[PDB]
Amino acid sequence: NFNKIFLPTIYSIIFLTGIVGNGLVILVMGYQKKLRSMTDKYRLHLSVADLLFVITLPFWAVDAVANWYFGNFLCKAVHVIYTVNLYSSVWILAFISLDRYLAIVHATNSQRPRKLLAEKVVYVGVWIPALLLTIPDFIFANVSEADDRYICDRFYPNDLWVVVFQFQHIMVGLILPGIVILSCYCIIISKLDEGLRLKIYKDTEGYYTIGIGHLLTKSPSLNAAKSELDKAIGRNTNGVITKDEAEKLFNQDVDAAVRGILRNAKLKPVYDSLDAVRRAALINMVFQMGETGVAGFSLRMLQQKRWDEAAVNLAKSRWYNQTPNRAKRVITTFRTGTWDRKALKTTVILILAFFACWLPYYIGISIDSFILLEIIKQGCEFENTVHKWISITEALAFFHCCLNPILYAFLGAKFKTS
Amino acid sequence: NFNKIFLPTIYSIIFLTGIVGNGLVILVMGYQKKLRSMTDKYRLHLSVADLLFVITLPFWAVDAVANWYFGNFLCKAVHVIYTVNLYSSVWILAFISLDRYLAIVHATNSQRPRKLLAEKVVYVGVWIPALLLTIPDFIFANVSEADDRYICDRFYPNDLWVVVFQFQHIMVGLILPGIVILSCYCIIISKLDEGLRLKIYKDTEGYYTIGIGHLLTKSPSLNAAKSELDKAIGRNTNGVITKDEAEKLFNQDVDAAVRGILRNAKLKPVYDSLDAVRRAALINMVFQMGETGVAGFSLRMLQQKRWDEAAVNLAKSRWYNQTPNRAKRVITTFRTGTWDRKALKTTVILILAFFACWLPYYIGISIDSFILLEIIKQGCEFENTVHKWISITEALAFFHCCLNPILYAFLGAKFKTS
Ligand SMILES: CC1(C)CN2C(CS/C(=N\C3CCCCC3)NC3CCCCC3)=CSC2=N1
Ligand SMILES: CC1(C)CN2C(CS/C(=N\C3CCCCC3)NC3CCCCC3)=CSC2=N1
């Protein structure tokens, strides 16, 4: 009878650490609009989905120890809230995988629909279908007099319905979101202006070129051009070159054009004052215009460490109109950085921890599936202990509601003092 | 007892019209490699999937009338083949929807993965998972002595398994492929070189422009440019213009530049000799180079109706290297046509007819679902007639195996004689 001691303790912890945890998130998210990334818009939805559930936990605690005093309406309410929290939380995490797929795989053109998903579809795809999935809780969940106490849960006409709702749970809860999440990160891990071409091509003017804009020869002869760049790598290739070979050739194109920046006195106090990322943006500008071209700028502002003042000044040139998309990237690189890892890790460890909480519960249910479907035929003492290890794992699983705020803790905090 | 007369007749028709029908497809598809579209590669897979099933139908005919003489191995074989044909056929049609989505929505860059899906993934996505789905037929399908006759079908430990396999059937067979198909055509219906911009922008040189390369004024003044093109449409817009407005402006840009082609004597016997589509390709060439530019070509071949001779000649110019992707489209348009409707209708009517054959069967199963799950509680005479109308609708559904070859009939045939 010790389930009165285990379960109400575990339920009390999640309600207390969840009301404070998820409570702070919703409160802080509303306090400011300036600092809001796409993942932070989704993590707010996750907080509302979890707060709504954590508040129903004291009812779960009382029901474990004593009785369902709350009535028939509140028996329907807690089950409905359990169905919303179950499918929404997992599907919001499926959208965070979808958002991460768009933010990295579509580097350039991404924010365009990333907002469409986060603010518009996030309801059509997550809130509207999850609330529709609660329909059986309204029909089936009911209070009934189990011997000596009022029992409250889903009661169906037959035991076949248990399977219709267990299969549906595995489908919408774990198999379908699991495919989406595992697809997104599978694309992310494997896949992680001037253009890259691994086979010989003619440029805007018809000269033989290969890799990131490297020029072989202005001679119209096919074989004479190949042999002029067969000796640049050190192999008989007949054109076609590897990705790492092109990276070395681009590095040789930079390493030779990067020496010229250090010799030209007009931009050398500008390039040196520039940190790494902004330093590379000027080199990206050099390959396009040339050392004399770029040194005619919008440069006295960039060296003085005046960021936004030089950025708007560069946008008042002809290079801004000649190459519109190609120039905007360069200008934004001076203002900020490599925005054309830590954020990817936070969501990866959030999704990995979400299925970690739910892993001991999955194992439990998987055993009953074999019990009802007659795969394992151990009597009644064994099944009595399988069920004894479902409620504990389900309670332990609920800790997932504390994963989202726990990852927001110690944000910007310097772990230095001892 | 009339099911001996209805069912073996319906089974005999599908085996005879299927062996001839699907037989001819596989045979003809192999005879030539030249004429092969993406849909035709998928329709061959559909033919093999249906031929394999139609050959098992005489066994279905004998089993309806007399007995399962064939044995325990062949009872497992027919069920396995039924599972392959069920999920593969529907999922091949899901790939035809996916291929149609790539061929139309990605107009330019499509054939690239359209081949990846059709030849490489078509096995990983359709053949490999369908053959894995047959596993329960090997375990459950068995011959047993129903009173006075040998009955052969899936026998499980309990009636809960019927639900685990009915829900799985609806999921992999109809709900999941249905979402994919309905998604693809939903995108196709709604969504059905120089670039289109509905808001004022600066061109390569910094002059105010709007729509498909229409030039307002070289004056750097914002309001003076707007008012110069506020009078071109006849409304106070403050920049922003509609899609139909831009189409009228492009038509006014063409209608004025199309008059010039009819006045220049150098190309007027070329433009006039050119049919519609190839005529538009030359206009697309005019807006880029201008009436004097294009009239310097590669033109005496195009007017003489020598197609491929002019195409390779145009690819030997500087315009071919200056605008590589933009020129290749124009050259291909002279060789062939608008390749940058009838094919879309054939697949639409194939998918619509596929679910039409399966519609009376879906209705039948849907009633038993309510019977087992206790939604409708009509005794034993009603259910005896629901089952009496499942086998007929299942037999009538099998006609779907004759849909793929029937659509290949009368191809190129002139319906003129009477
Ligand atoms: C899936 C589900 C919502 C369903 N369920 C269940 C079955 S109902 C139930 N009471 C509550 C479970 C949580 C929702 C409110 C009813 N049983 C017993 C009754 C005796 C005391 C212990 C719990 C246990 S934990 C759980 N979680
Ligand atoms: C889904 C399924 C493959 C399963 N099935 C069934 C149930 S098995 C079955 N015999 C055959 C069905 C087709 C496969 C081979 C067994 N029953 C009766 C036995 C008495 C005579 C009439 C049919 C009927 S039609 C059908 N189609």
User: B206 contacts in A (CB within 8 Å)?
Assistant: 318, 321
In 3D space, the residue among B117, B185, B169 whose CA is nearest the CA of residue B352 turns out to be: B185
| Structure letter (DSSP) for residue B77 | H
How far apart are the C-alpha atoms of B226 and B233, rounded to whole Å? 11
Considering the domain architecture, whether residues A229 and A114 belong to the same structural domain is answered as no
Q: How far, in Å, are A129, A385, A394, B83 from residue A381 at the CA level?
A: 39, 7, 21, 39
Considering the domain architecture, whether residues A187 and A276 belong to the same structural domain is answered as no
Probe residue for ligand 1, chosen from A63, A153, A155 as the CB with the greatest number of ligand atoms within 8 Å: A153
* Method by which the model was determined: X-ray
Residue B82 CA: nearest ligand 2 atom is 3
Distance A60 CA to ligand 1 centre (A): 7
Q: Is B85 annotated as a binding residue?
A: no
Q: Which of A194, A255, A308, A309 is catalytic?
A: A194
The structure tokens 């070859």 sit at B405
Supply B21's token pair: 């029908």
Work out how many CB contacts closer than 8 A connect A with B.
58
Pick the last residue of a domain from B291, B324, B340. B340
Considering the domain architecture, whether residues A106 and A170 belong to the same structural domain is answered as yes
Considering the domain architecture, whether residues B151 and B225 belong to the same structural domain is answered as no
With an 8 Å Cβ cutoff, are A373 and B318 in contact? no
Whether A403 and B187 have beta carbons less than 8 Å apart is answered as no
Considering the domain architecture, whether residues B115 and B129 belong to the same structural domain is answered as yes
Q: Is A313 annotated as a binding residue?
A: yes
For residue B95, what is the domain's CATH number?
Answer: 1.20.1070.10
- Name where chain B breaks: residue before each gap, C-N > 2.5 Å: 192, 297, 340
For A303, the domain range is 193-340
Pick the last residue of a domain from A297, A319, A340. A340
Pick the last residue of a domain from A292, A314, A340. A340
Whether A52 and A87 have beta carbons less than 8 Å apart is answered as no
Considering the domain architecture, whether residues B171 and B210 belong to the same structural domain is answered as no
In 3D space, the residue among B170, B191, B25, B174 whose CA is nearest the CA of residue B100 turns out to be: B191
User: A159 contacts in B (CB within 8 Å)?
Assistant: 160
Residues with CB under 6 A from ligand 1: A 60, 63-64, 78-79, 82, 151-153, 391, 394
Domain total of chain B: 2
Q: Which resolution in angstroms does this entry have? A: 3.2
Distance A168 CA to ligand 2 centre (A): 27
Question: Closest residue (by CA) to atom 25 of ligand 2?
Answer: B391
β-strand pairing of A149-154 with B141-146 = unpaired
Considering the domain architecture, whether residues A242 and A354 belong to the same structural domain is answered as no
For residue B198, what is the domain's CATH number?
Answer: 1.10.530.40
User: B202 contacts in A (CB within 8 Å)?
Assistant: 321, 324
Considering the domain architecture, whether residues B268 and B132 belong to the same structural domain is answered as no
Considering the domain architecture, whether residues B50 and B127 belong to the same structural domain is answered as yes
With an 8 Å Cβ cutoff, are A171 and B168 in contact? no
Considering the domain architecture, whether residues A212 and A301 belong to the same structural domain is answered as yes
How far apart are the C-alpha atoms of B360 and A156, rounded to whole Å? 29
Q: Is B313 annotated as a binding residue?
A: yes
User: A373 contacts in B (CB within 8 Å)?
Assistant: 157-158, 160-161, 164
**From A161, A321, A373, residue closest to B373, measured CB to CB:** A161
The structure tokens 């599907």 sit at A91
Supply A148's token pair: 């000596």
| Structure letter (DSSP) for residue B54 | H
**From A201, A206, A373, residue closest to B160, measured CB to CB:** A373
Scanning A320-339 for CB atoms below 8 A from B yields 321-322, 324
Distance A392 CA to ligand 1 centre (A): 12
Count CB atoms within 10 A of the CB of residue B16.
14
Considering the domain architecture, whether residues A186 and A249 belong to the same structural domain is answered as no
Count CB atoms within 10 A of the CB of residue A386.
18
How far apart are the C-alpha atoms of A88 and A49, rounded to whole Å? 7
Active site members of B? 194, 203
How far apart are the C-alpha atoms of A114 and A40, rounded to whole Å? 13
Considering the domain architecture, whether residues B16 and B129 belong to the same structural domain is answered as yes
Supply A109's token pair: 């053109």
Q: Is the CB of B151 under 6 A from ligand 2?
A: yes
How far apart are the C-alpha atoms of A254 and A287, rounded to whole Å? 8
Backbone angles phi, psi at A209, to 5 degrees: -135, 160
